[PDB]
Amino acid sequence: MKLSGVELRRVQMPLVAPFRTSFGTQSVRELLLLRAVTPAGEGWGECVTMAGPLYSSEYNDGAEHVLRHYLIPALLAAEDITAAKVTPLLAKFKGHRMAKGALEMAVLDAELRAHERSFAAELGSVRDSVPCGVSVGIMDTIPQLLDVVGGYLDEGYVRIKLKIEPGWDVEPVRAVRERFGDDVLLQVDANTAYTLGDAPQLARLDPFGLLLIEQPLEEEDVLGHAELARRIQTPICLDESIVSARAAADAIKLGAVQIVNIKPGRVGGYLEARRVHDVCAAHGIPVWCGGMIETGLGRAANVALASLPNFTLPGDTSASDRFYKTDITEPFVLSGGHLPVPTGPGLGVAPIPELLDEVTTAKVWIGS
Amino acid sequence: MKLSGVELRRVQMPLVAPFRTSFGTQSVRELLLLRAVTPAGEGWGECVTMAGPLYSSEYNDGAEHVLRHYLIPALLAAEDITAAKVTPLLAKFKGHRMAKGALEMAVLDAELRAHERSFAAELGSVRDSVPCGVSVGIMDTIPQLLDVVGGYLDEGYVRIKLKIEPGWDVEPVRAVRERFGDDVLLQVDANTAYTLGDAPQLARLDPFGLLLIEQPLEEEDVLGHAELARRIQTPICLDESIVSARAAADAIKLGAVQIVNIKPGRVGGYLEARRVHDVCAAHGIPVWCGGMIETGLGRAANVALASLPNFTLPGDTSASDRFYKTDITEPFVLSGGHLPVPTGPGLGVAPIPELLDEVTTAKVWIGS
Amino acid sequence: MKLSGVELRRVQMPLVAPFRTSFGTQSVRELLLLRAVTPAGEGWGECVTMAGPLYSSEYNDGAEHVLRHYLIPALLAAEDITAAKVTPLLAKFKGHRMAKGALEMAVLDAELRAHERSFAAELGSVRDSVPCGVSVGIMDTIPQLLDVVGGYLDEGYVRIKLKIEPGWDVEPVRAVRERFGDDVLLQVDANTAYTLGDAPQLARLDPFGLLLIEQPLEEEDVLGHAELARRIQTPICLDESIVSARAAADAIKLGAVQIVNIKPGRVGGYLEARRVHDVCAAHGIPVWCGGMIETGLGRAANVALASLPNFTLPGDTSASDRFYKTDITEPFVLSGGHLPVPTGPGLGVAPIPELLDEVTTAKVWIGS
Amino acid sequence: MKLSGVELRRVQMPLVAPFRTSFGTQSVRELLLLRAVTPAGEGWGECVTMAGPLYSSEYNDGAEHVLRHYLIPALLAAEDITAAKVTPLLAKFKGHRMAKGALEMAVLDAELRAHERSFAAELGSVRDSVPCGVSVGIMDTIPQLLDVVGGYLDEGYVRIKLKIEPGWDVEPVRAVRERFGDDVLLQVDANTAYTLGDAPQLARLDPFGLLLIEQPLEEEDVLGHAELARRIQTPICLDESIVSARAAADAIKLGAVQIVNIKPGRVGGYLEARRVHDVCAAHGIPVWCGGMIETGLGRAANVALASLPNFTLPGDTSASDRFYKTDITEPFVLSGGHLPVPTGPGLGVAPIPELLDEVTTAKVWIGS
Numbered sequence A, B, C, D: 001m002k003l004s005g006v007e008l009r010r011v012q013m014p015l016v017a018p019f020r021t022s023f024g025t026q027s028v029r030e031l032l033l034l035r036a037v038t039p040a041g042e043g044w045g046e047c048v049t050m051a052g053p054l055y056s057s058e059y060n061d062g063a064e065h066v067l068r069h070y071l072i073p074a075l076l077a078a079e080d081i082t083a084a085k086v087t088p089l090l091a092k093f094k095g096h097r098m099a100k101g102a103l104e105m106a107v108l109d110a111e112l113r114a115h116e117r118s119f120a121a122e123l124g125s126v127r128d129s130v131p132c133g134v135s136v137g138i139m140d141t142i143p144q145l146l147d148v149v150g151g152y153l154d155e156g157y158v159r160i161k162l163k164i165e166p167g168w169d170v171e172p173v174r175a176v177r178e179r180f181g182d183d184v185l186l187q188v189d190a191n192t193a194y195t196l197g198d199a200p201q202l203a204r205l206d207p208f209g210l211l212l213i214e215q216p217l218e219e220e221d222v223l224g225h226a227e228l229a230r231r232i233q234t235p236i237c238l239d240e241s242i243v244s245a246r247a248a249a250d251a252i253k254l255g256a257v258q259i260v261n262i263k264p265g266r267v268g269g270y271l272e273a274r275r276v277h278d279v280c281a282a283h284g285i286p287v288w289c290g291g292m293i294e295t296g297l298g299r300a301a302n303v304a305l306a307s308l309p310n311f312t313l314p315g316d317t318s319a320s321d322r323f324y325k326t327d328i329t330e331p332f333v334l335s336g337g338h339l340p341v342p343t344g345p346g347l348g349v350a351p352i353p354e355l356l357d358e359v360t361t362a363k364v365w366i367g368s
């Protein structure tokens, strides 16, 4: 491969239903898409960044900037390009994992299509379909919340995940467990909302039989999680914290994590994500696929990933309709609480031009 | 893919020069080669077992049997096959890593060729050539040993590794450091010949500035290695003990190893081997490619693997001629202490039929 | 002694009722038998290997090959032979414990009968009988199980073992505890069937008061068990993982075991079995005899071992008729939950020829 | 068997040359012998206790007593008697290991002699000869010492042990290293003479390259030895502290010992001794036979013992003439630093009555 250039697209997609988290509400999804361009064909990449630096320090406009001025250029400059080589090529730039992962993807997509290979084959899928769960937002009311869960539960979702915030913890759970029963697959997500000093509160959930608690404390607070793990019964699961395989190895080493949520862009690439999977696996730590409310592009790479062997817990790989009415690709449709792993070269999906143009807000071409 | 069958060959290659280890003297190499047949095309796999069970429990005749009666059959009996599904497919059978790795190899090649991909591309190479060291056996005399060293040193080999054994330790090493200097890459390999009680004697090599000592103790003695490490200055490197990515992680966690020698057949396959690479890498453990006196087939696969990012040490990927006068494939030729990584699909190499047939002793077809 | 040769015999013995494990079901029992020939007399040995590598990497055909080609001949070669010297004579060959164990036994039996001493004598017995429990397969139904359990309880079986498997854990347990009570000697066996990631479900068994969980995880996952052991209540027991006294020690050392199932063949001989016993003892770890569905031959020397001092828990030494209608020896009959330790020299029992020949499929001589 | 009775003798052998320890000068050796009297044949036993309670609380007369009144009787009362059973039989009695040791020994001998078995055979010997070193007492002068040593060195002794005491440490060492060279197997023996507070002085030996320091501190000070092992280069050897297999296990687990000195009587028998060996082995702890200035009666058994596998270091099994001018059995002669392992049943040696009666100072029957 030889990099000809990339096309940076901004994309706005209205959410079907506002999505509330510890960091706020989301009614509309701005994304960043990349179209890799090589002499042979095209490759698409999606960036998980958001408008503002709320989940992380990375935001859309900042991603754009680095990609433009630093990353992309860097790659164009290179004689021979390999997805694998991207890393080494961009190594000199500290951070910007999400952005670097977006780029990698685009390239990899192209690389794979060129060899007629799906993301799944590369990654090492062992399945064809994958159990899906769903992430439910914070509510304003308990019934509003219960109705919703009942909603998703009916659709066939296999697991229920609750966004928590101090103020929306125990109760919400107390509620779902009560209503829906104890056999449901429930788990919660703080997105960093708590402090070690909130332990008791969190210990308040021990009773509820959760599978895990996701990132109760800040991203840098590994030890703290380790400590927290000590004071509570609900299993710790890290997200934000896991920005790499080595991070995972360290957190596991320290006892700060028992289950790992994998988010490909957070870790800087689907490639790195495979390693993380592999590392955890070696340590006996279970992984599951996380989600960034992506279009059908990332959704598709994620489904492929999620079919790896250590993903022994359902992922946030919901169907397309959970967030979008109209997906830029062929939508993802839940079939028996499952999604099928794409079969075509590369992602195994592509944007429906028409669709894409409808939701595009900007564009740009980065060529040498 | 769908497996059509596998041909089993028995090869018998003469050794340029007898090869002495802590387990015994070797003049002729007996191999087991596999040709996996698929709708798509053939694939080649090489098994590292040997005549007897001296390095491990695995031996040629045994691998053959297991292959023939359990493993091949089980794959044949699957609907879809992928190199990656081979593992789960053969998981019901305990052990036989070497045999498994051969088969996966054959599969993988055949699969890679189809997608017109190279082992190296698949594995994640970031290098186009690799530093090669040389494994120097046990000599009858020191002079003899010194000449040989001198010889290899001239061919341009980058590092020297000396087979050791009780009665062939500190001298042979003192002498080589003597002659050749302090600036040479020197390391040693006991092939499990020592005991913890021997620490004192091994402590004797402290002064020579070796890079590592390879498998001082028995295969199952990890804790011993962690202890042993506390007794010597020479860093520990494990070979026989690393039978998996999990083995690796365990040993690392226990402080039993500081550098890992990856051997694909020993760990059940190239795929597993990548995982080890990745695990180590995440724990800051350097790896380096092992060698089992393979033909160009296995040599090729190894060069590819050895071009991965964490192989920060010269491996035992010497030139073909180091062992064999006539290799059944294009020969591997040292260019400035390096060997070039193959570019073609799959192994990037294949057997020269007329050559292969010469060395072939037995063949069999394993189909449905 | 002086080894004159060995008679390999193949034996098929239909099961009294199909025996289902996490690794599959078993209606018949192929076995390997060895008749050790000395200028003085005969010796018998039994190999625990099965048809295929489902419990371990060892299998009947595999053991025969190694015995034939490597092991037996290595002993015949030796000038003077002691059961004790067997080890060091066969040391060059890696692994192959089950086989190595049978041979030893074969040898031992001869050597003893020659000193007019019983296995029990040599091993260091302290009892005259031993309490027997029984291994209870995986059933088709719960009732089916229950009958069976009850059935055994009445025969007089001292303790109950329940083979478990994901999908056959808690319930089958919940049942026996419920129906049969709380004062029954209950323990399970997951023949490696779980994963650390399954802890929670295994945690689900805390309440039943089981004596122990036998081998929840893979053979190689010792640190896993130690971790596991920190997540459940049910004490851990290892079988597969314990291949030697050294293995024992390490496990213990690591906090991955509290009770040890002793399987002489597994560990490579009755002699090593003794050693394990003593090692476990020294660490305050209780042991108990494991069974490998043996003939009266194996069953006899096991009853002998089961009589050592640290065997402080009922072993799997069920009466002959629990599996076999007709034994090649004089049956082992349960007299009030116990079995009598043999009194003759060597094993104490011999094959009832007429009975052998009736169930012997192959035969071979291995002389000079 | 059936114990018919025990004849207790007192013996008094005049040392060749006074032997000085950190506990006192020795001119004559006063032992306790035992004649097990069975229906079949008789057995010999030899107690390592000394005249007074100096090495340990046990002493000749205390021994007699307990034997006579407690021990002997216990066994006679028993219907069935096997050396193995002696231990359970004498359990109720707290301590007196040397005494139980001597007794067991007597029984064992008889038992073995009745199966026509050797001590060796039973214990599991693998060698036929053992490597002997010597125990060099505290001299009055340096030159004196040096002479002796060279004295012993010339006879063919393989390793040198130097008794030490505050004031007899470094110097004496400095002297033998100086004069005799560095490639001498040198080791010391403080017989409990130091304290943790003397670490610095003992650290003073670091330089000499000793194989070990035997029992630097008190019997009960395990943890102190572990601490000590932290403050010194010289590897810690325990003697007095090793009263059992368990104790070995524990001391090792705590890092208080790296080499273990085996004294059969000190541990309560030969059986136990074997176990300690086994234990140590399983933990990669080398062992070596310890001597208590014994006749050709203890000497024999030991020699057998010393032929076990884990006896990786030269024992204190000096030739008969190192202490005694005229042994009560066939003397033991150094053959190239070695001492042949006795081939006859039981100890393989007996006391020459003429010789015996000469040294005996008393006698006594103990029957029913």
Ligand SMILES: CSCC[C@H](NC(C)=O)C(=O)O
Pocket: A021, A055, A134, A135, A136, A189, A214, A239, A290, A291, A292, A293, A316
């Ligand atoms: C843009 S919010 C990201 C946080 C995310 N929630 C979901 C359901 O996508 C998670 O932690 O899995």
Ligand SMILES: CSCC[C@H](NC(C)=O)C(=O)O
Pocket: B021, B055, B135, B189, B239, B261, B290, B291, B292, B293, B316
């Ligand atoms: C059965 S040989 C195994 C030892 C091998 N060296 C070479 C190149 O032979 C290695 O230890 O890397």
Ligand SMILES: CSCC[C@H](NC(C)=O)C(=O)O
Pocket: C021, C055, C134, C135, C136, C189, C214, C239, C290, C291, C292, C293, C316
């Ligand atoms: C043939 S599988 C053997 C496993 C054995 N059970 C019995 C009852 O023999 C055990 O407890 O592991």
Ligand SMILES: CSCC[C@H](NC(C)=O)C(=O)O
Pocket: D021, D055, D135, D136, D189, D191, D214, D239, D261, D290, D291, D292, D293, D316
């Ligand atoms: C009176 S000897 C006691 C201590 C003893 N020395 C010898 C030579 O027997 C030893 O440490 O083995």
Ligand SMILES: [Mg+2]
Pocket: A189, A191, A214, A215, A239, A240
């Ligand atoms: Mg999250």
Ligand SMILES: [Mg+2]
Pocket: B189, B191, B214, B215, B239, B240, B261
């Ligand atoms: Mg090696």
Ligand SMILES: [Mg+2]
Pocket: C189, C191, C214, C215, C239, C240
């Ligand atoms: Mg079991």
Ligand SMILES: [Mg+2]
Pocket: D189, D191, D214, D215, D239, D240
């Ligand atoms: Mg001493």
